[model samples]
Target: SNFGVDFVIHYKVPAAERDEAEAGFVQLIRALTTVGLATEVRHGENESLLVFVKVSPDLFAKQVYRARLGDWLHGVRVSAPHNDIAQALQEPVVEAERLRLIYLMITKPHNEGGAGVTPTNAKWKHVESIFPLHSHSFNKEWIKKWSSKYTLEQTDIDNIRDKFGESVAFYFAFLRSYFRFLVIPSAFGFGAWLLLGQFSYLYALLCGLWSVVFFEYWKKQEVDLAVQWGVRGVSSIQQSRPEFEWEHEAKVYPPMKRVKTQLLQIPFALACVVALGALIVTCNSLEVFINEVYSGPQYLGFLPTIFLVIGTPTISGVLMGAAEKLNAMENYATVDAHDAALIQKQFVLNFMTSYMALFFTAFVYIPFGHILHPFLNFWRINPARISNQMFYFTVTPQIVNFATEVVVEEAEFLQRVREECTLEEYDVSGDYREMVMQFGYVAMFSVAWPLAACCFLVNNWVELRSDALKIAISSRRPIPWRTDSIGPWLTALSFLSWLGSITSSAIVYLCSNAWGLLLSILFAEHFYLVVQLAVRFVLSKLDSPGLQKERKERFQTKKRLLPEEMFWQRQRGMQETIEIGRRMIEQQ
Candidate 1:
């Protein structure tokens, strides 16, 4: 029989504990039943148990109605009945939302009798991943359709929102808008590069303003997307982290305890700056020694390159270690609060480390001309030219990452649930980090190279579809969670925008020296603050058709069939010998 299942859970039973881990499995299958999802188990490996997740129209029709009721009760713009949702519940696009709900139901809380599966907590220790299965069934057509399109339109996003997730949909919306905005800089930069000279104060000034306008427009634009997606004010309504450990006192609320931990972050940040900072300084000098001093080897820069690769991940790993320790100590109450706070915590590491190379070059090489000169003299090597620094920055990942997807996606059929359960889960956090970092390159450092924006334009043009391909195949369809905007990263762009002004101006100061420099920066920054206010003014006047549709349409939200009969019919298949149930799973 063809095993057409919707999800394969990775269940590696640990140690001799791996033998006969049935009670926990029963507890897991039991919890899923409470959520109306006891579809019976499927094929097995020594460690994993593949389960049949029966996806029917009514299960999701039930999910659709429940979510609408929730939105209505909470006054969250109760998305009016527009689709043949009941009929379309059979389709993967919309059903994907149901799958997400199923995920939340399992992950919610054993505290309230929900499954509460988390490896760290040891609640559902074997339950490492729960995700949706892809069917090239419908996706190959959609990807082809999207790739052929010259530009993304409203309907494209609407289709995306309907298909993957609200969380996923927002990025493409942000990316598209950013792309439109990119054309302005790209077109201007190309002409400036040819017609003008290096380091134009005029180009820097306009670039600063362009960043200002971009950040502002996107803030207001989030409202339109939120309203269109009918997920406005969603952050206000969020679930608690199932794993939150509690406090005995009221006034002892997290902040006081959090303060001591929070104080440590400054030390952590500075120490890392020292750690990663000194290391990179070492790498830089070493690179000069290998490439310039020796002048004889084909492995020109490989020596320092190896160390940088090793140290970068080392620094990053330690930061991640500090992050988890620093975070859980604060005692965040809800998923949204925890995520926002943790994201804030992690950004310090991200901003510092990710931007470390550029920050060094910007402050030292571009402006001051070799703060490393004293050290360089000792080494007896000529300092590397500052001009070629950005040139070295670059992507084999797209090819490797894309190739892995096809390999894994096709291999899933033959390997079935075993390898299927072993893939990486998708999160939008890394994707947003990537885009914002790219934005910093355009907004922050482009003063050095006017063509940076031109190059980035082409990069992001393909990024649109590459991410589409990414969502389809690379990772499991992301859980269709709700959000109002591109969270945290927007805050990042704000930081980058203002810093670009300060950094860009100072770079000019080192190049020529000026009151003109101070004045230029102040004007751009003050204008940035002023334009932000200007944006909300315009945004208030703009209306959302989605929000409008909800107002006009508060209309309606669908049915339940029996799971007892449904489950048992499939239980017959689950019982039979498949891989001989892992050869009695060490039966002895």
Candidate 2:
């Protein structure tokens, strides 16, 4: 059979509900028929059918047009001759966008513009998954080329944006600026480790300063990326999420009670800290006791390693489920509700567990001299230990992750393709956090180890490639959606900087005691306060091509249609000037 296909959907038949299942299955085929006849064929497993669409592209095109009108309502680049017409004039339907839009109609709710065929929702439970065809040509060429090229070019990025839509584009786009920013610190960090030694006061200030600059620069960089790409208001005139079921209630309770209900997750996070806290805290104590104090079979030193692995909270599964229950049970009236609860719970729980061991080993703050007296006296044996971890953190894990990602039998092609298909879909959140966590190493761990930026610089280069590989081939293509900018990530970035400012002073003060010639101290106060205002004012004031394009065209039209003399007419200026001093002089 001749076929042209972009998507394949799976339908499974249930044995117990054979009658009901067929009824629903047939109902689905009819829905597909609403657009056009979908080609149906049997599947690899028992009692299942695969339905692929050679299907009409017109219906998909309809949604595209509607989304076009959606943007026009926001007055987005109207004189640009509509995005679709401009694109059609250029080359094609933006097939990457074409594929993304079709899958969305297949998966989104019917009430809100989609055909409402989301498989996981109750209405379409039997429809297993809506699948997009893998792009072997693009995937192979992409992998081959990135393997050869040292840097990802703007051409590749725009191609990515064109292929995946702006939602995916901004992420990879975000990575490039971020990757470029890593260079200075990385090289400088290397020079520090080479010359300065651990507990170096200089690298501490340098690292935090670098972190702040990159953060501030990106504040405007996000804006810059959108303006050039014409995605400045891309999420504008868009609807709320497809899954959020909007309901109107005539009567409501005190909203503070709603606020109280939201705060419920904070305790959940604390309890997790207590739970994961006790588990790791005890093991950490045992770990140190064995290493620092034990004089036994030496193999007892291995016990902490053995038990901690088996006992490790590996809390990903359990916590994710429970957190979802907290989310599911509460009737969240708005989107921000989930965003706030999750980011808050996640930040604290991760913060406590991530550094609790370090706090136990070294003092958590620099004020340890008075309060720490007898308690952490043994912790004075440091430079060697912290430097040792820098090895474990960098060379070892970095080597393994790169080796596994680059060689891990994925080049075994066909089976690897199947294996990767089963891998989880792309998520920007995880990678964003990875970068943020590595950042804390500089901010918080600076005095302990100055080489972090160097390590991150190298690892991030490797990290950038691996995740591109992850998204391009390892994970399925995710449904494209729109957003103006990165969310809680901004919040976390700000938090990390503030935390760094606090910890930088404390760590250097207690440990370095050598401190600056006071310049780094003097430097911090001046750079942060003075430079930022000038920097923000300078950046926030700039205009872009987007503003002048359609809006300026409107101005030109008004100018042409009206008399030039009308602008600064003698009487007009004289009349306005006459009134300027009238109120002031009359009042006087």
Q: Model 2: per-residue lDDT, tens digit, 1-588?
A: 113555666667767878788888777777766644365654424555666665455555566676666566686544433446233434246766577667656655556565666675456777766666556678778777877888888888878777666767777777777778878777777788788866666766676677777787887777666765655675444443334443445723356655776688768867877776566545544545566665985546445434443333355446655776766555454445555556555555555645554454444323332433333344423324434443344344465556665895222433333343355667776676566666665666655666666677777777777777888776877656555566667778778776665555545555554345355556655555565566567656776555556577789868867988876674566666778669659888
Error of 1 at 262 (Å): 3.1
CA-lDDT, candidates in order: 0.68, 0.61
User: For candidate 1, lDDT tens digit of each residue in 26-81?
Assistant: 77777677666646565556656665554455655666656566675775655443
Please list all clashing residue pairs in model 2, or write none if there are none: 110-116
- What's the lDDT for candidate 1? 0.68
Please list the residue runs of candidate 1 whose C-alpha ends up more than 4 Å from where it truly belongs after superposition: 1-6, 18-20, 55-64, 78-93, 110-122, 249-254, 283-330, 365-373, 381-387, 394-414, 513-516, 541-588
